[PDB]
Design an enzyme around this catalytic site. Structure first.
Site, PDB file in Angstrom:
ATOM      1  N   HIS A 156       0.846  -1.220   0.000  1.00  0.00           N
ATOM      2  CA  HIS A 156       0.000   0.000   0.000  1.00  0.00           C
ATOM      3  C   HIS A 156       0.873   1.258   0.000  1.00  0.00           C
ATOM      4  CE1 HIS A 156      -4.375   1.216   0.730  1.00  0.00           C
ATOM      5  NE2 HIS A 156      -3.708   2.235   0.144  1.00  0.00           N
ATOM      6  N   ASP A 357      -7.894  -7.546 -20.136  1.00  0.00           N
ATOM      7  CA  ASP A 357      -7.830  -8.600 -21.178  1.00  0.00           C
ATOM      8  C   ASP A 357      -6.353  -8.834 -21.501  1.00  0.00           C
ATOM      9  OD1 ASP A 357      -8.122 -10.269 -23.450  1.00  0.00           O
ATOM     10  OD2 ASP A 357      -9.142  -8.709 -24.648  1.00  0.00           O
TER      11      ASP A 357
END
Length: 408
Positions: A156, A357
Protein backbone atom coordinates in the site's frame (compact mmCIF):
# COMPACT_ATOMS: atom_id res chain seq x y z
CA UNK A 1 -13.46 -26.44 -1.07
CA UNK A 2 -11.28 -29.00 0.85
CA UNK A 3 -10.66 -30.84 -2.54
CA UNK A 4 -9.11 -27.75 -4.31
CA UNK A 5 -5.43 -28.48 -3.42
CA UNK A 6 -3.18 -25.64 -4.77
CA UNK A 7 0.37 -26.85 -5.64
CA UNK A 8 2.86 -23.92 -5.86
CA UNK A 9 5.42 -25.25 -8.41
CA UNK A 10 7.87 -22.28 -8.81
CA UNK A 11 8.61 -18.60 -7.88
CA UNK A 12 10.97 -16.22 -9.81
CA UNK A 13 11.93 -12.51 -9.94
CA UNK A 14 10.58 -10.70 -13.06
CA UNK A 15 12.75 -7.62 -13.89
CA UNK A 16 11.90 -4.81 -16.35
CA UNK A 17 12.39 -5.88 -20.04
CA UNK A 18 13.75 -2.52 -21.37
CA UNK A 19 14.55 -4.29 -24.72
CA UNK A 20 10.97 -5.47 -25.53
CA UNK A 21 9.84 -1.77 -25.08
CA UNK A 22 12.95 -0.45 -26.95
CA UNK A 23 13.81 1.78 -23.94
CA UNK A 24 17.19 2.68 -22.34
CA UNK A 25 18.09 0.54 -19.28
CA UNK A 26 17.23 2.57 -16.12
CA UNK A 27 19.86 3.12 -13.37
CA UNK A 28 19.52 0.46 -10.58
CA UNK A 29 20.62 3.42 -8.32
CA UNK A 30 17.44 5.51 -9.10
CA UNK A 31 15.49 6.28 -5.85
CA UNK A 32 11.91 7.71 -5.46
CA UNK A 33 11.30 9.01 -1.89
CA UNK A 34 7.83 8.29 -0.37
CA UNK A 35 5.51 11.36 -0.28
CA UNK A 36 3.68 12.33 2.99
CA UNK A 37 0.42 10.98 1.41
CA UNK A 38 2.22 7.60 0.80
CA UNK A 39 3.37 7.53 4.50
CA UNK A 40 -0.30 8.27 5.55
CA UNK A 41 -0.80 4.51 4.75
CA UNK A 42 0.43 1.51 6.83
CA UNK A 43 3.34 -0.78 5.78
CA UNK A 44 1.10 -3.70 4.58
CA UNK A 45 -0.08 -5.70 1.51
CA UNK A 46 -3.57 -5.76 -0.13
CA UNK A 47 -4.58 -8.93 -2.09
CA UNK A 48 -7.16 -9.54 -4.88
CA UNK A 49 -7.94 -12.49 -7.25
CA UNK A 50 -9.32 -12.55 -10.85
CA UNK A 51 -10.67 -15.72 -12.60
CA UNK A 52 -10.57 -16.22 -16.44
CA UNK A 53 -12.26 -18.96 -18.58
CA UNK A 54 -10.19 -21.68 -20.37
CA UNK A 55 -8.96 -19.76 -23.50
CA UNK A 56 -6.11 -18.38 -21.24
CA UNK A 57 -2.66 -17.09 -22.38
CA UNK A 58 0.29 -19.31 -21.30
CA UNK A 59 2.36 -18.42 -18.16
CA UNK A 60 5.23 -17.38 -20.54
CA UNK A 61 3.09 -14.69 -22.33
CA UNK A 62 1.75 -13.42 -18.93
CA UNK A 63 5.37 -13.26 -17.55
CA UNK A 64 6.84 -11.52 -20.68
CA UNK A 65 3.93 -9.00 -20.38
CA UNK A 66 4.79 -8.38 -16.67
CA UNK A 67 8.50 -7.80 -17.52
CA UNK A 68 7.34 -5.36 -20.29
CA UNK A 69 4.77 -3.61 -17.98
CA UNK A 70 7.45 -3.20 -15.20
CA UNK A 71 9.44 -0.79 -17.51
CA UNK A 72 6.58 1.78 -16.93
CA UNK A 73 6.07 0.55 -13.27
CA UNK A 74 9.66 0.06 -11.90
CA UNK A 75 8.20 0.82 -8.39
CA UNK A 76 6.69 -2.74 -8.39
CA UNK A 77 10.17 -4.15 -9.39
CA UNK A 78 11.80 -2.13 -6.54
CA UNK A 79 12.41 -2.49 -2.77
CA UNK A 80 11.49 -0.30 0.24
CA UNK A 81 14.57 1.26 1.90
CA UNK A 82 16.13 4.65 2.86
CA UNK A 83 17.57 7.24 0.39
CA UNK A 84 21.31 7.74 1.27
CA UNK A 85 21.28 11.57 0.73
CA UNK A 86 18.17 12.44 2.90
CA UNK A 87 17.66 9.57 5.42
CA UNK A 88 14.06 9.46 4.00
CA UNK A 89 11.96 6.24 3.48
CA UNK A 90 11.96 5.61 -0.33
CA UNK A 91 11.31 3.13 -3.18
CA UNK A 92 14.73 1.95 -4.51
CA UNK A 93 14.29 1.28 -8.30
CA UNK A 94 17.02 -1.48 -8.13
CA UNK A 95 14.93 -3.57 -10.63
CA UNK A 96 15.35 -6.65 -8.33
CA UNK A 97 11.90 -7.69 -9.64
CA UNK A 98 8.29 -8.58 -8.73
CA UNK A 99 7.60 -12.19 -7.56
CA UNK A 100 5.85 -14.33 -10.24
CA UNK A 101 4.47 -17.58 -8.69
CA UNK A 102 3.23 -20.45 -10.93
CA UNK A 103 0.73 -22.88 -9.34
CA UNK A 104 -1.85 -25.58 -10.28
CA UNK A 105 -5.20 -26.57 -8.68
CA UNK A 106 -6.29 -30.27 -9.04
CA UNK A 107 -10.01 -29.37 -9.70
CA UNK A 108 -12.17 -27.66 -12.38
CA UNK A 109 -12.58 -23.97 -11.31
CA UNK A 110 -16.39 -24.41 -11.89
CA UNK A 111 -16.42 -27.05 -9.02
CA UNK A 112 -15.55 -24.33 -6.35
CA UNK A 113 -17.70 -21.47 -7.87
CA UNK A 114 -19.38 -19.37 -6.67
CA UNK A 115 -16.23 -18.93 -4.50
CA UNK A 116 -17.06 -17.50 -1.01
CA UNK A 117 -14.60 -15.64 1.29
CA UNK A 118 -12.89 -18.40 3.38
CA UNK A 119 -9.17 -18.71 4.36
CA UNK A 120 -8.77 -20.99 1.25
CA UNK A 121 -8.94 -17.84 -0.99
CA UNK A 122 -5.50 -16.87 0.52
CA UNK A 123 -4.09 -19.96 -1.33
CA UNK A 124 -4.68 -18.17 -4.73
CA UNK A 125 -2.24 -15.21 -4.14
CA UNK A 126 1.24 -14.85 -2.59
CA UNK A 127 1.29 -14.07 1.18
CA UNK A 128 1.69 -10.45 2.41
CA UNK A 129 2.29 -11.71 6.02
CA UNK A 130 5.68 -13.63 5.71
CA UNK A 131 7.86 -10.46 5.26
CA UNK A 132 8.33 -10.51 1.45
CA UNK A 133 10.93 -7.97 0.16
CA UNK A 134 9.04 -7.79 -3.22
CA UNK A 135 6.47 -4.90 -3.37
CA UNK A 136 4.34 -6.69 -6.06
CA UNK A 137 3.69 -10.49 -5.80
CA UNK A 138 1.63 -12.18 -8.60
CA UNK A 139 0.38 -15.81 -8.75
CA UNK A 140 -1.12 -17.62 -11.79
CA UNK A 141 -3.03 -20.80 -10.76
CA UNK A 142 -4.08 -23.05 -13.71
CA UNK A 143 -7.14 -25.27 -12.93
CA UNK A 144 -7.77 -28.76 -14.47
CA UNK A 145 -10.37 -27.12 -16.85
CA UNK A 146 -7.74 -24.67 -18.31
CA UNK A 147 -9.26 -21.70 -16.34
CA UNK A 148 -6.70 -19.45 -14.54
CA UNK A 149 -6.89 -17.47 -11.29
CA UNK A 150 -4.60 -14.37 -11.27
CA UNK A 151 -3.82 -13.27 -7.65
CA UNK A 152 -2.21 -9.89 -6.70
CA UNK A 153 -0.46 -8.99 -3.36
CA UNK A 154 0.59 -5.29 -3.47
CA UNK A 155 2.30 -2.98 -0.89
CA UNK A 156 0.00 0.00 0.00
CA UNK A 157 2.98 2.39 0.64
CA UNK A 158 3.66 2.27 -3.17
CA UNK A 159 0.18 2.87 -4.72
CA UNK A 160 -3.49 3.59 -3.72
CA UNK A 161 -6.46 1.64 -5.24
CA UNK A 162 -6.51 3.79 -8.44
CA UNK A 163 -2.70 3.54 -9.06
CA UNK A 164 -2.69 -0.26 -8.32
CA UNK A 165 -5.71 -0.69 -10.72
CA UNK A 166 -3.67 1.24 -13.38
CA UNK A 167 -0.82 -1.35 -13.01
CA UNK A 168 -3.29 -4.30 -13.39
CA UNK A 169 -4.54 -2.72 -16.67
CA UNK A 170 -0.93 -1.80 -17.68
CA UNK A 171 0.06 -5.50 -17.31
CA UNK A 172 -2.93 -6.63 -19.49
CA UNK A 173 -1.96 -3.90 -22.08
CA UNK A 174 1.78 -4.86 -22.20
CA UNK A 175 0.85 -8.61 -22.43
CA UNK A 176 -1.07 -7.80 -25.70
CA UNK A 177 2.00 -5.80 -26.92
CA UNK A 178 0.32 -2.35 -26.42
CA UNK A 179 1.75 0.80 -24.72
CA UNK A 180 0.41 1.40 -21.15
CA UNK A 181 -2.53 3.88 -20.67
CA UNK A 182 -2.61 5.93 -18.59
CA UNK A 183 1.00 7.16 -19.23
CA UNK A 184 2.52 6.87 -15.71
CA UNK A 185 3.93 9.84 -13.66
CA UNK A 186 6.76 8.78 -11.26
CA UNK A 187 8.38 12.15 -10.25
CA UNK A 188 6.95 12.06 -6.65
CA UNK A 189 9.49 14.66 -5.29
CA UNK A 190 7.63 17.16 -7.63
CA UNK A 191 4.33 16.49 -5.69
CA UNK A 192 2.80 17.37 -2.27
CA UNK A 193 5.57 19.87 -1.31
CA UNK A 194 4.74 22.06 1.74
CA UNK A 195 3.40 25.62 1.15
CA UNK A 196 5.65 28.63 2.02
CA UNK A 197 4.62 29.46 4.60
CA UNK A 198 2.98 26.31 6.13
CA UNK A 199 -0.81 26.58 6.87
CA UNK A 200 -2.54 23.91 9.07
CA UNK A 201 -6.31 24.75 8.75
CA UNK A 202 -7.70 21.55 10.48
CA UNK A 203 -6.96 19.11 13.39
CA UNK A 204 -4.82 16.19 12.05
CA UNK A 205 -3.93 14.84 15.55
CA UNK A 206 -6.47 12.12 16.55
CA UNK A 207 -7.42 11.65 12.82
CA UNK A 208 -4.28 10.85 10.67
CA UNK A 209 -1.65 11.15 13.52
CA UNK A 210 -16.04 -15.84 19.26
CA UNK A 211 -14.49 -15.75 15.68
CA UNK A 212 -14.80 -13.28 12.70
CA UNK A 213 -16.43 -14.75 9.52
CA UNK A 214 -16.60 -12.84 6.16
CA UNK A 215 -20.04 -13.12 4.46
CA UNK A 216 -20.92 -11.82 0.94
CA UNK A 217 -24.16 -9.75 0.99
CA UNK A 218 -25.64 -9.07 -2.52
CA UNK A 219 -27.49 -5.69 -2.82
CA UNK A 220 -29.83 -5.71 -5.90
CA UNK A 221 -30.91 -2.68 -8.01
CA UNK A 222 -34.45 -3.16 -6.55
CA UNK A 223 -33.12 -3.13 -2.92
CA UNK A 224 -30.87 -0.07 -3.71
CA UNK A 225 -33.88 1.89 -5.18
CA UNK A 226 -35.86 1.08 -1.94
CA UNK A 227 -32.93 2.43 0.22
CA UNK A 228 -32.92 5.63 -1.94
CA UNK A 229 -36.74 5.90 -1.17
CA UNK A 230 -36.21 5.89 2.68
CA UNK A 231 -33.52 8.55 2.00
CA UNK A 232 -35.46 11.26 0.05
CA UNK A 233 -35.50 15.12 0.40
CA UNK A 234 -28.08 11.58 -3.89
CA UNK A 235 -25.60 8.59 -4.14
CA UNK A 236 -25.92 4.72 -4.20
CA UNK A 237 -22.50 4.58 -2.37
CA UNK A 238 -23.45 7.22 0.29
CA UNK A 239 -26.85 5.43 0.95
CA UNK A 240 -25.22 1.94 1.10
CA UNK A 241 -22.37 3.12 3.44
CA UNK A 242 -25.06 4.76 5.70
CA UNK A 243 -27.21 1.54 5.70
CA UNK A 244 -24.21 -0.79 6.35
CA UNK A 245 -22.94 1.59 9.13
CA UNK A 246 -26.39 1.52 10.88
CA UNK A 247 -26.75 -2.29 10.47
CA UNK A 248 -23.20 -3.15 11.78
CA UNK A 249 -23.83 -0.82 14.81
CA UNK A 250 -27.26 -2.51 15.42
CA UNK A 251 -25.73 -6.03 14.89
CA UNK A 252 -22.90 -5.30 17.45
CA UNK A 253 -25.57 -4.27 20.07
CA UNK A 254 -23.46 -1.25 21.22
CA UNK A 255 -24.75 1.00 24.04
CA UNK A 256 -26.49 3.93 22.22
CA UNK A 257 -24.14 6.51 23.87
CA UNK A 258 -20.94 5.00 22.27
CA UNK A 259 -19.54 7.28 19.48
CA UNK A 260 -19.28 5.34 16.13
CA UNK A 261 -17.35 6.46 13.00
CA UNK A 262 -17.12 5.17 9.36
CA UNK A 263 -13.76 5.77 7.55
CA UNK A 264 -14.38 6.64 3.83
CA UNK A 265 -11.44 6.90 1.35
CA UNK A 266 -11.35 10.25 -0.56
CA UNK A 267 -9.27 10.49 -3.81
CA UNK A 268 -7.62 13.98 -3.79
CA UNK A 269 -6.43 13.80 -7.48
CA UNK A 270 -9.34 15.91 -8.95
CA UNK A 271 -9.92 17.81 -5.61
CA UNK A 272 -6.43 19.48 -5.56
CA UNK A 273 -5.34 22.44 -7.82
CA UNK A 274 -3.12 21.77 -9.64
CA UNK A 275 -4.83 18.38 -10.41
CA UNK A 276 -2.74 15.18 -9.90
CA UNK A 277 -2.61 13.23 -13.22
CA UNK A 278 -4.53 9.86 -13.20
CA UNK A 279 -1.14 8.27 -14.22
CA UNK A 280 0.48 9.22 -10.84
CA UNK A 281 1.75 5.86 -9.40
CA UNK A 282 1.55 6.93 -5.71
CA UNK A 283 -1.14 7.36 -2.99
CA UNK A 284 -3.46 10.44 -3.19
CA UNK A 285 -5.89 9.27 -0.42
CA UNK A 286 -7.11 10.75 2.91
CA UNK A 287 -10.17 9.57 4.94
CA UNK A 288 -13.50 11.28 5.78
CA UNK A 289 -14.61 10.09 9.27
CA UNK A 290 -18.34 10.90 9.74
CA UNK A 291 -19.07 10.29 13.49
CA UNK A 292 -22.34 9.79 15.48
CA UNK A 293 -23.65 8.13 18.69
CA UNK A 294 -24.93 4.55 18.07
CA UNK A 295 -28.42 5.76 19.22
CA UNK A 296 -28.40 8.80 16.81
CA UNK A 297 -27.27 6.44 13.95
CA UNK A 298 -29.83 3.56 14.50
CA UNK A 299 -32.94 5.50 15.79
CA UNK A 300 -32.74 8.63 13.49
CA UNK A 301 -33.77 7.96 9.83
CA UNK A 302 -31.26 6.73 7.13
CA UNK A 303 -31.50 10.33 5.70
CA UNK A 304 -29.66 11.76 8.78
CA UNK A 305 -26.71 9.29 8.38
CA UNK A 306 -26.46 9.96 4.57
CA UNK A 307 -26.27 13.76 5.34
CA UNK A 308 -23.48 13.30 8.01
CA UNK A 309 -21.45 11.36 5.36
CA UNK A 310 -22.17 13.99 2.59
CA UNK A 311 -21.00 16.91 4.85
CA UNK A 312 -17.85 15.16 6.21
CA UNK A 313 -16.74 13.86 2.71
CA UNK A 314 -17.16 17.42 1.23
CA UNK A 315 -14.92 18.77 4.10
CA UNK A 316 -11.99 16.59 2.76
CA UNK A 317 -11.34 19.00 -0.21
CA UNK A 318 -8.18 20.40 -1.92
CA UNK A 319 -7.71 22.60 1.19
CA UNK A 320 -7.85 19.57 3.60
CA UNK A 321 -5.23 17.68 1.51
CA UNK A 322 -3.03 20.87 1.58
CA UNK A 323 -3.54 21.18 5.41
CA UNK A 324 -2.50 17.47 5.82
CA UNK A 325 0.65 17.93 3.61
CA UNK A 326 1.96 21.02 5.56
CA UNK A 327 1.29 19.35 8.96
CA UNK A 328 2.73 15.86 8.06
CA UNK A 329 5.94 17.77 7.01
CA UNK A 330 6.13 19.68 10.40
CA UNK A 331 8.02 18.85 13.66
CA UNK A 332 3.78 11.64 15.79
CA UNK A 333 3.02 8.34 13.88
CA UNK A 334 0.17 7.42 11.42
CA UNK A 335 -3.19 5.97 12.70
CA UNK A 336 -3.39 3.56 9.67
CA UNK A 337 -8.06 -6.83 13.81
CA UNK A 338 -11.42 -5.38 15.10
CA UNK A 339 -12.55 -1.77 14.40
CA UNK A 340 -15.48 -1.70 16.98
CA UNK A 341 -16.97 0.75 17.76
CA UNK A 342 -15.98 1.95 14.22
CA UNK A 343 -16.11 0.55 10.64
CA UNK A 344 -14.16 1.17 7.39
CA UNK A 345 -15.78 0.93 3.89
CA UNK A 346 -13.20 0.30 1.10
CA UNK A 347 -15.13 0.90 -2.21
CA UNK A 348 -13.71 -1.09 -5.23
CA UNK A 349 -16.58 -0.06 -7.62
CA UNK A 350 -13.92 1.33 -10.09
CA UNK A 351 -11.92 -2.04 -10.11
CA UNK A 352 -10.79 -2.96 -13.68
CA UNK A 353 -12.94 -5.89 -14.95
CA UNK A 354 -14.59 -5.45 -18.41
CA UNK A 355 -11.29 -4.12 -19.96
CA UNK A 356 -8.71 -6.38 -18.15
CA UNK A 357 -7.83 -8.60 -21.18
CA UNK A 358 -4.47 -10.47 -21.41
CA UNK A 359 -5.45 -11.77 -24.92
CA UNK A 360 -8.08 -14.40 -23.84
CA UNK A 361 -10.97 -12.05 -22.96
CA UNK A 362 -12.23 -10.29 -19.79
CA UNK A 363 -12.39 -12.06 -16.39
CA UNK A 364 -15.74 -13.71 -15.38
CA UNK A 365 -14.99 -13.37 -11.60
CA UNK A 366 -13.14 -11.16 -9.05
CA UNK A 367 -12.97 -11.22 -5.21
CA UNK A 368 -11.08 -9.49 -2.39
CA UNK A 369 -8.77 -11.85 -0.42
CA UNK A 370 -10.14 -13.23 2.92
CA UNK A 371 -9.69 -10.34 5.43
CA UNK A 372 -11.25 -11.48 8.75
CA UNK A 373 -11.10 -7.90 10.31
CA UNK A 374 -14.39 -7.07 12.14
CA UNK A 375 -16.02 -3.91 10.62
CA UNK A 376 -13.63 -3.67 7.57
CA UNK A 377 -16.26 -3.72 4.76
CA UNK A 378 -15.34 -4.02 1.02
CA UNK A 379 -17.93 -2.76 -1.54
CA UNK A 380 -17.58 -4.44 -5.00
CA UNK A 381 -19.59 -4.58 -8.27
CA UNK A 382 -21.64 -7.86 -8.68
CA UNK A 383 -20.23 -8.30 -12.29
CA UNK A 384 -23.85 -8.40 -13.68
CA UNK A 385 -23.31 -4.91 -15.23
CA UNK A 386 -26.70 -3.71 -13.80
CA UNK A 387 -25.18 -1.56 -10.97
CA UNK A 388 -25.99 -4.13 -8.21
CA UNK A 389 -23.37 -4.13 -5.36
CA UNK A 390 -21.68 -6.96 -3.38
CA UNK A 391 -20.61 -6.15 0.24
CA UNK A 392 -18.01 -8.41 1.96
CA UNK A 393 -18.80 -7.95 5.73
CA UNK A 394 -16.44 -9.38 8.40
CA UNK A 395 -18.35 -9.71 11.76
CA UNK A 396 -18.17 -12.07 14.80
CA UNK A 397 -20.31 -15.26 14.29
CA UNK A 398 -22.91 -14.09 16.95
CA UNK A 399 -23.61 -10.76 15.09
CA UNK A 400 -23.86 -11.93 11.41
CA UNK A 401 -27.55 -13.12 11.43
CA UNK A 402 -28.51 -9.86 13.27
CA UNK A 403 -26.55 -7.90 10.54
CA UNK A 404 -28.20 -9.78 7.58
CA UNK A 405 -31.75 -9.21 9.04
CA UNK A 406 -31.07 -5.43 9.41
CA UNK A 407 -29.54 -5.35 5.84
CA UNK A 408 -32.71 -6.85 4.16
Amino acid sequence: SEFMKVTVLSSRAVKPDYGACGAPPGSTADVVPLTVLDKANFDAYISVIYAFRPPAPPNAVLEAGLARALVDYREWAGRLGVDAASGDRAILLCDAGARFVEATADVALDSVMPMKPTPEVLSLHPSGDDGPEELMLIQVTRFACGSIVVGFTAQHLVSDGRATSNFFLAWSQATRGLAVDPVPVHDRASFFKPRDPPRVEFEHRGVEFDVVVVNKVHLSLEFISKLKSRASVHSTLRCLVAHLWRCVTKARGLDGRVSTSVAIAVDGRARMSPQVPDGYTGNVVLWARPTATAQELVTRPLQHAVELINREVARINGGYFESFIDFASSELVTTAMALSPNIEVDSWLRIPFYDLDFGGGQPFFFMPSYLPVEGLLILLPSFAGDGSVDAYVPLFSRDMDAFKNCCY
